[model samples]
Target: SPPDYSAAPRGRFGIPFFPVHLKRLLILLLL
Candidate 1:
């Protein structure tokens, strides 16, 4: 699972974070 960083607190939305866009790339990379 991807981790979180301060200043970029990943809450319920984070834990939607702002990675919403990048998450797809990340998941595909992870896959």
Candidate 2:
């Protein structure tokens, strides 16, 4: 199960680039 993250802090930018960076990080982690 996913850990509780409802209270996580959100980035101020909240831009698509932010999520894109995060997705890339996840992909790199997989590799």
Candidate 3:
């Protein structure tokens, strides 16, 4: 199951970094 980072708590996991990781993850999934 894909993790839902959309509702992730701010600051706890460094929200700024989540998008980059998510984008890469999505790309990998596509591949």
Candidate 4:
């Protein structure tokens, strides 16, 4: 199984950009 990529304690801006949330933001931008 693929390793689950989960949300981090901090948000997108908290530290290194959170991948899950970051992708969401990118989708919004693209939309």
Which candidate wins on lDDT?
3
For candidate 1, write residues 1-31 as lDDT tens digits.
Answer: 6876565445445344456779888999999
TM-score of model 3 relative to the true fold?
A: 0.40
Cand. 1 TM to true fold: 0.33
Q: After superposition, which runs of candidate 4 have C-alpha atoms over 4 Å from their true positions? A: 1-17
Put down candidate 2 lDDT per residue, 1-31, tens digits, no spaces: 9788555455752334467888899999999
Which is the winner by lDDT between candidate 1 and candidate 2?
2
Quote the RMSD, in angstroms, for model 4: 7.1
For residues 1-31, write the lDDT of model 3, one tens digit per residue: 8766566567665456557888999999999
> What RMSD does each model have against the real structure?
9.4, 7.4, 8.5, 7.1
Clashing pairs in 3: none
Rank by lDDT, highest first. Answer: 3, 4, 2, 1
The true-versus-predicted C-alpha distance at residue 17 of model 4, in Å, is 11
TM-score of each: 0.33, 0.42, 0.40, 0.39
Q: Name the lDDT of candidate 1.
A: 0.66
Instruction: Assess candidate 2 and give its TM-score to the true structure.
Output: 0.42
Off by over 4 Å in 2: 1-14
